[PDB]
Structures are given as structure tokens and as C-alpha cells.
Design a protein around this nucleic acid. Structure first.
Lengths: 98, 106, 83, 92, 91, 104, 79, 97
DNA sequence: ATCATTTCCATTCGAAGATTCCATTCGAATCCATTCGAAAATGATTACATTCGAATCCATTCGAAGATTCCATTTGAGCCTGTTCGAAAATTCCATTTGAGTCCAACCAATGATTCCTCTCATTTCCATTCAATGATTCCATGAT
DNA sequence: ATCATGGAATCATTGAATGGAAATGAATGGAATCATTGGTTGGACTCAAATGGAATTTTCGAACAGGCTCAAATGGAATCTTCGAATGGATTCGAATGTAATCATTTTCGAATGGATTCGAATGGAATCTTCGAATGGAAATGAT
């Protein structure tokens, strides 16, 4: 039997997803999530498909940015594992919070 | 006779239209005849710089056609365009491949 | 209609993982995924509120890509490609 | 009813710089977004300059101080150059 | 040669009738009004433009305040603006 | 009669109308717009003046100073976020010490 | 050597108003860099405003406009 | 002899300066620094005294903010001492760097 | 928890000065009336978003082995902080100089408005060529031995 | 160190999709002519910003003592990565619905404008008062037993 060591497929995935630009969240889940949120704001709305595509581009771009900063926070704490305390520190210094 | 102001300024970008958008956009009641010339110049210049660096990255990806990934590589590897677009998102740009040193194996 | 509820769970753990990898993340604690779902949820709310505000102002019932683009610029997260 | 973009011009400049390279529809949309963005940043800052100075006109001098404020460093110097040269060519 | 000081002072007397303002605290208040004015007016101008309309009405100012003001501040301000406008028409 | 009176305002509906016309926001300004705007301005001035005043007399003082405005702004959530990116000259900070720096 | 006029005790006072219990010794020069960069970016912008008004005096309003542009809006000096 | 324990006079300095609003850098040096810096951009300029006050208010407000975030970074690393590495992380996350 | 020098905090007084209450004034908002357009409206007409089920593809997740990262701990250095103490230099004061910035007034120069029209640029179908989807392919970095 | 595994990067292959072209439509920028005034220029003037030099109040500092944090190194607990694959979920596609958006020509209102006046808000200059700065002990930590 052959088994990669923990961290190997991770590094290879970093290389794989940093080389690509395709959207990383599947499309239908993200669309339903958009309709749920917007419905809780106003009822009886529809969406141009390009509006959900804008939303999803903006979102993945925001989250990937945030994981960059989260990861700098783990490493600052001498860790390799991103934790919620890392994310929360990123968002507090970004001034999105607290 | 009839020759456009873009020609009289030596420009690829349309001085007339930049003048109409200036008048029609509520920046001030009146637009000197010099302001759209100089603006259309700066816009053409920055378009030229971006396309320059994007074309370069498209030619190291061995492809004919600039795609957003290429604009994104151009912006983020150039220091000053990067800052100009610090708070901007290129749809379908991706990120710059960068792995923190300490995550590499030993 | 049908009832929309619990859709943030549709953003699965593997997709949060892919987003974490494009962002340079080697190892993800198990409490990250729900925290990610939290932050995404706030992000979309703050964008979508403003977009809907532009659409309501246009006396329209269809949210347009321009409404999203205006909201994002307004929110400080300017987007190119729908413009 | 019809719309406007900068595609013909972006495409012209593309031909000047990189004569055998093409541009995709999405890359062009990115470019259109870039021009409209920067247009709005210059025009906005110049408008602010006129108001601050009790003037009703945006002259090429407004556009220029705008460009100095908005663009970083070497980008500013090149762009101011390219604009000043288009303007003298335009008048004289 | 202009300020908002007489109105800031009037409203201050309305709300807390026996307390005063320092000079520089009044400067803070004047700066605050001018900042918020400019944010509302600016966003309203944009809303007009986006909707291909040449005029800024109270509906623009309203959508502006909703975009600009957080939560409960938005809700109270929308009310007190709508009540100033109906009160203004019938009077 | 001034429009401020017919709207019940301490803030100047006329002047706000003139700044609107004269500020390059649009070609034309409805007469409802300076009313509704000056309303919002007087309102927010008032909310800040209330919370600031409160702090001014719980700090044993007669006159609102920037410190009191700063206490008001930062201890209120929605004013704080509205003025997130603003700096009050002479505001100071509001006292906060990280627990882990405390003794014992 | 004017950046040295911002002394160590002044940097430490600012750090205390910021809630800082203990200050490493390399902080003081590092702060001195960051402060200087801050002053550069604002004062450059302020001076541009002065140059455009064809003035020789940088005015508090020039400073305020610069700060607003930099994302550091200041209340209390005329805007 | 009696001497407070290390850390106490610090905590009390925190209490004293968070309780007050005065500018913490002495003013003449800061004026000198401002005039020097401005010279390198345009020669030779003058200043409304209110302009130097505006700059100093903005400077100190920025620095206190930055020490707030720096200190959260130190604490995040299980330390009580702010190090340049902390400032650099704060500035990179803020997007100043 | 024990008593003991620090220091913080409060207190109570006196003037130093900053608010504000008020006299004056001139500039701005009102009024009032009118031209003319921007906004509102309805109605016929797309069109593209929503929805459908069916087929097909792609991604998910459940549950477990064990790798390895996080953390708790000790422990020893090195580097902080706190006590003066001398001491420079920031401050305060005041008084002078005078250059810049302002303020009208007469004046020049350049920007609007507009009508006709021609030249450009938008959009469309048309078609050529790049991109891609897949398949086997050798290459190569990793993991077992 | 050697070699097998499996993922990746590389070979054109065979065609779907996407561009860059070509043909013309309709609309917009250019052209050419002006009241029209904002910009400019200038001559006179006031306000504020050094400057200066002296007292003066005050910070700053160099230098040591020893506390205590920080860092390195250490052990095992626990948590997170990798693995296979049934299947749930998504993606695809073709289509029918119907609903909202958009183009169009009708005027309903509303906001521009501008002249002439009251009234209001700016400013300055005088008092009323709050705030600040003392000196002076009491609660209160905070360090040593």
C-alpha cells in the first residue's frame, strides 16, 4: 500500500489552487445561500445570473484574502494550523470588527 | 475638412467623449478644453502600461490572448500598479503562487 | 415557492478547504469551518443588503450585476469584470 | 438602446504595445472596468480641487494635480509627462 | 465665514439645556456636520447618476441615509426625515 | 417663514439647499431634499450631543469638551462604526487594558 | 537628526496610551521609521494642495484634505 | 530602600495616559521634524500653527492605534512585549504594507 | 492575609481665562412669479429568469489508521524596568519685523449653447483560429525498503 | 543510499467555442458663431508667521541592579491529514412560463431664475462664569514580611 505523508497532498493542493482561477465554491449551494439572505431582506426578488456570479467572485476573493492574513497570524504564533483565534485577530486588525 | 481632437492631441483615446463624460458627470459646471485632453492621455498611458505587463505574462503562459489571470499577474507583480489597485478585485484573476517558507517540508 | 433555510451549510467543508489552499494554508483546525461560515454569512449580508437597497431604489424586482458592483464599491471591495 | 465602452481604444493600444497578442471578452471587461474606475478617481479628485479653491472650472491643471495625488511615484511622473505632451500638441 | 455653530448650540440647548460646549468641541461638531453632509450628498448624487436622473430628491437622500447609516441610526434618521418632509408640505 | 420652521428644524433648510445646488451633486435639487437632509443632520447632531452631555456631567463638568465627544462616540456601537475612520482632535482613548497584562 | 528628537520616552508614552505593558528595545527605531513614513505621505499630499492653490503656506485645511485622502479623516481643524 | 515590582509603574502609566488627552510628543522637536520632511518636497514653505497641530494630532492618533494592534499581535504570540515583528504584522494586515 | 511608603484621589479654595451673552450689520434666504423640461405614466412588446424533470457527472462524507503538530513545562540567559541624578533643551514670554495672502476693480480670454451633418462607433451575422477536452505519455517527486 | 507508486507535466488530437472581421446603422462629435462671465491681473492693504533671545520649567538620560519574561528543548496527548467509493448533490439541457424591464410617445407637475427686501447669522468686544491649579490629608494599592 502507498500513503502520502500528512502535509504532502496539502502542499500539492496549495500549488494546484494557487495556479488556477476557477471558482472554488460549488455554484448551486452558493446561489441558494444568496437567495436565502436576500429574501430575509426583501421578498419577491430575482437575480441576473451575472449578479450571483459577481457575488461569488467577490466572496471567494474576500475569503482567500482573509485566509492569507489568518495564515500569517498562525505563523506569527509559531503554528502551522489556522485557528479561529487567528481569523479573529485578522478581522480585528483589518478593522472589520472590534 | 473634419479632424478629431484625439488626432490633434496624438491620442488613441477619445478626447471628445472624455470631455462629454466630464461635462455630464457633475464634477463642475464647466470643463476647460485642456482637461479632457490630459485625462484621455493619462488613461491611455495607464492602459498601455497594464497591457504591456499583461501581454508579457500572456507570452510566458505560451498563449495568444490576454485573459484576466494575465492582468492579475501583471498588476500584482508590478509594485506601483499593485498599489494603485490595492483595494480592487480582478474577476478570475486568482492569486500569486506564494507558499510561506515555513510550510515547505524539511 | 419553497422555504429557504440553513443554506450556509451548503458551503461544504471541502470548499472552505479549497479556498484555504488558494490562500496558502497548510493545516486547518476543525473549528475553522463553522467560523468561516460565520464570516461568509456576514460578508454576503453586508453586500446583499446594499445591493438590495440599490435595487429597491431603482423600483426594480431583479437584482442586477450593477447593483452588486455598486454595493461592493460602496463596501470598499471594488470588483472589476462586471463594471 | 445602445451602450458605450472603451474596447476599440483598449484594443488599439494593445496593438501598439504587443502587436500579435489578443484579448478575451472577460479581459476586455476588466480593462473597461479599469478605465472607468480611474476616470472616476481622477475626475472626482479634480472636482474636489476646484471646489476647494473656489473655482467653477476643471482645467488641465486640475487633472494634473489629481494625477499627482492619485498615482504612485513613477506612474505619476510618466503620466503627467504623457498628458502635458498631449496638451501642448493639442493647442499649439 | 460660515459655520453650523448656532444650530449645534440651539440643538444642544434643546437636548441638554444646562450644559455648554468648549470651543474645540464645537469645532468637532462643525467638522462632524460637514463630513456627514458630504457623505449623504455624495452618495445621493451617485444614486441619481446610476438611475439616469438629473435631480436629487428626498428619495435619494433617504436611500443615501440607508446606505450610509448603521442599523438603528438609519431607522431613526429615516423617520425624522420623513416626518420633517410631511410636516413641511402640510405647513 | 423659513423652511426650517415649516419643517420644525433647528438646522438651516435654506443653506442646506444652497450647498446642495452649489456643490455639484446634480443638475437640480428638489425642495424635499434639503428638508429631509437637514432633518438627518439635526438628528445626528442631537444624538451625539445627548450622549456627549451625559458623559460631561458624569465626568463632573459643565461644558462638553472633545474628550466627552470621544467617550460618547466610542462607547456607542453605531456612532463608533459610523465614525470608524475618523479621529477626534483631543479625544484620547477610552480606558482598556488587556486582561493578560493585569497583575496576579 | 530630527527624527531623534522624538525621544524614547515620547514613544513609550504613546505606547502606554495604547495599552502596552512592555516595550522591546528595537521598537523605538522601528516606530521612528513608521512615524516618518506617516509624515511623508501626509505632508507630500498636503504640500501638493498648497502648490495647487499657488500658496507658500501649508494651511490646516491642506493638512485636513491630505488626511481625508489618506483615509485618516480628522475632526477639529475646519473639516 | 523600596522599589515597585517591574510592570506596576507600566500598568499605572497605561492608566494615566489612557485617562488623558494631551499630546505626548514634545512639540518643538515634532515641528522640526515636520519642517524638515516638508522641505524635501517643496522649498521653502511655511505653516499655519494649526496645520502643525493637525499633523501632530493625526500622528499621535495613528501611532496609538498602531500600538493597540501591535499589542494584540504580541499577546497573540503568547508574549507581553511588543517587538518589531508585531508592528510589521499589524501593518501588513491593515494593508499598509 | 500583615502592617507600611508610596502614590492616587479628592478636596477646597482663588484667579485665569474661555463662553457666551449681546450690539451691530450686510449678506443670504424668501417671495413671488414664470418658462420648459424632467419625471411620471400606460401600453404594447420583448426576453431572460425561473422552473421542469431527465440524464449524467462530479464531489462529498463517513469513519478509521497513525503521523505529527500543539501545548505544557522546566529552566537558564538576556534584557527588560525602575530608582535616582545631572542636566540639556523644550517652553514660555514678548516684541519685533514684513511677506504672504487677501481684497476689489477694471479687463481679457475662454467656455457655453446650438444647429446641421458627417464620421465614428455600436452591433450584427459571418468565419477563421485559438482554446480545450481527452487520451495516452514519459517524467518526476515522494514513499517504502 | 535503490526502486515502485501515482500524480503531474507533456504529446498532439479533432472540434467546440470564441474571437477579430466585415457590412452598415444611427447617433454623436465636430464645426462654426457668441453673449457671457469666470479667470486674471493689479494695486493696496492687513493679518499672521517667523525670529529672536532670554529666563524658566522641565523633561531627558546614562547607568546599574536583578526580575522576569522569552526562548529553546523536551515529552505524549489529541487532533488533523490521507485514504477509498457509495451516493447525494450538482451540473447539464431542453423547454415552457410569465413577468418584469425596456422602448415609446403622451403631459403632469416641479424646480430654475431673478429681481427687491427683510431677517438672520457673522463678528466682535465686554462679564459671567467654569475650569484649572494649587496646596493638603485620606483612602488604596502594592511590597515587605
Amino acid at each position: 500500500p502507498h500513503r502520502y505523508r500528512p502535509g504532502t497532498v496539502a502542499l500539492r493542493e496549495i500549488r494546484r489552487y494557487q495556479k488556477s482561477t476557477e471558482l472554488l465554491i460549488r455554484k448551486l449551494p452558493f446561489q441558494r445561500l444568496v437567495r436565502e439572505i436576500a429574501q430575509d431582506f426583501k421578498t419577491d426578488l430575482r437575480f441576473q445570473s451575472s449578479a450571483v456570479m459577481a457575488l461569488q467572485e467577490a466572496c471567494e476573493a474576500y475569503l482567500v484574502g482573509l485566509f492569507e492574513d489568518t495564515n500569517l497570524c498562525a505563523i506569527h504564533a509559531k503554528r502551522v494550523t489556522i485557528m479561529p483565534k487567528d481569523i479573529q485577530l485578522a478581522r480585528r486588525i483589518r478593522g472589520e470588527r472590534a | 475638412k473634419a479632424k478629431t481632437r484625439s488626432s490633434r492631441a496624438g491620442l488613441q483615446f477619445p478626447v471628445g467623449r472624455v470631455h462629454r463624460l466630464l461635462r455630464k458627470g457633475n464634477y463642475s459646471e464647466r470643463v476647460g478644453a485642456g482637461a479632457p485632453v490630459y485625462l484621455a492621455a493619462v488613461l491611455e498611458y495607464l492602459t498601455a502600461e497594464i497591457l504591456e505587463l499583461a501581454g508579457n505574462a500572456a507570452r510566458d503562459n505560451k498563449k495568444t490572448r490576454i485573459i484576466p489571470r494575465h492582468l492579475q499577474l501583471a498588476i500584482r507583480n508590478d509594485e506601483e500598479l499593485n498599489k494603485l489597485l490595492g483595494r480592487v478585485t480582478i474577476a478570475q484573476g486568482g492569486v500569486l503562487p506564494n507558499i510561506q517558507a515555513v510550510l515547505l517540508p524539511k | 415557492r419553497k422555504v429557504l433555510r440553513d443554506n450556509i451549510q451548503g458551503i461544504t467543508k471541502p470548499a472552505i478547504r479549497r479556498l484555504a489552499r488558494r490562500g496558502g494554508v497548510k493545516r486547518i483546525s476543525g473549528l475553522i469551518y463553522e467560523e468561516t461560515r460565520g464570516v461568509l454569512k456576514v460578508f454576503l449580508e453586508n453586500v446583499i443588503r446594499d445591493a438590495v437597497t440599490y435595487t429597491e431604489h431603482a423600483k426594480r424586482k431583479t437584482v442586477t450585476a450593477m447593483d452588486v458592483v455598486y454595493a461592493l464599491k460602496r463596501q470598499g471591495r471594488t470588483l472589476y469584470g462586471f463594471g | 438602446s445602445r451602450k458605450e465602452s472603451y474596447s476599440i481604444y483598449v484594443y488599439k493600444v494593445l496593438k501598439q504595445v504587443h502587436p500579435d497578442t489578443g484579448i478575451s471578452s472577460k479581459a476586455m471587461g476588466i480593462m473597461n472596468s479599469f478605465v472607468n474606475d480611474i476616470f472616476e478617481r481622477i475626475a472626482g479628485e479634480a472636482s474636489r480641487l476646484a471646489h476647494y479653491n473656489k473655482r467653477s472650472t476643471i482645467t488641465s491643471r486640475e487633472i494634473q494635480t489629481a494625477v499627482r495625488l492619485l498615482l504612485p511615484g513613477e506612474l505619476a511622473k510618466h503620466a503627467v509627462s504623457e498628458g502635458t505632451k498631449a496638451v501642448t500638441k493639442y493647442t499649439s
